[PDB]
Amino acid sequence: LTCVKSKSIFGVTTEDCPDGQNLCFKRRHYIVPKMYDSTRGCAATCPIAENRDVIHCCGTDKCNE
């Protein structure tokens, strides 16, 4: 599995996930309403949506882009 690790106006980083990490995630952490910072990566289990988080997990290559 490959997951996007960074995606910006400057470039994109893709990671081949290590053994045991067969999910990609994209986490949107909201600072104020309708404004948020996005983090992405591989994961073994879908990360917990903590305070102010919306988290999407998926299982195909670069599905979190």
Residue numbers in the entry: 1 to 65
Paper text:
In addition, mamba venoms contain aminergic toxins that recognize various bioaminergic receptors. Aminergic toxins belong to the three-finger fold toxin (3FT) superfamily, a structural fold known to support a large diversity of biological functions. Despite sequence identities that vary from 70 to 98%, aminergic toxins display highly variable pharmacological profiles. Here, we use the ancestral protein resurrection methodology on the aminergic toxin group in order to pinpoint the functional substitutions which may have occurred during their evolution and use them for molecular engineering.
In order to visually understand the evolution of the AncTxs, the crystallographic structure of AncTx1 (variant W28R-I38S) was solved. As it might have been expected, the structure was rigid, except at the tips of the three loops. AncTx1W28R-I38S represents well AncTx1 as the two mutations on loop 2 do not perturb the structure, as can be verified by comparing AncTx1W28R-I38S with MT2. Loop 1 is more susceptible to backbone variations, and both MT7 and MT2 are subjected to a large kink at the tip of this loop. The selectivity of AncTx1 is characterized by a slightly higher affinity for α1A and a much lower one for the α1B and α2C receptors, relative to ρ-Da1a. Having recognized that the substitution (I38S) in AncTx3 affects α1D binding and that (W28R) increases α1B and α2C binding, the appropriate substitutions were integrated stepwise in AncTx1 to boost its selectivity. The pKi values for the AncTx1 double variant W28R-I38S were calculated to be 8.59, 6.41, 3.71 and 4.85 toward α1A, α1B, α1D and α2C respectively showing that despite an impressive loss in α1D affinity (3.71 vs. 6.58 for AncTx1), the selectivity of this variant suffered from a large pKi gain toward α1B (6.41 vs. 4.75 for AncTx1 I38S). We increased the affinity of AncTx1 for the α1B, α1D or α2C receptors with just two variants, unfortunately without achieving our primary goal to improve selectivity. Epistasis, a phenomenon already stated as important in protein evolution may have been the cause as revealed by other ancestral resurrection studies. Indeed, the functional effects of a substitution could depend on its surrounding context or sequence background.
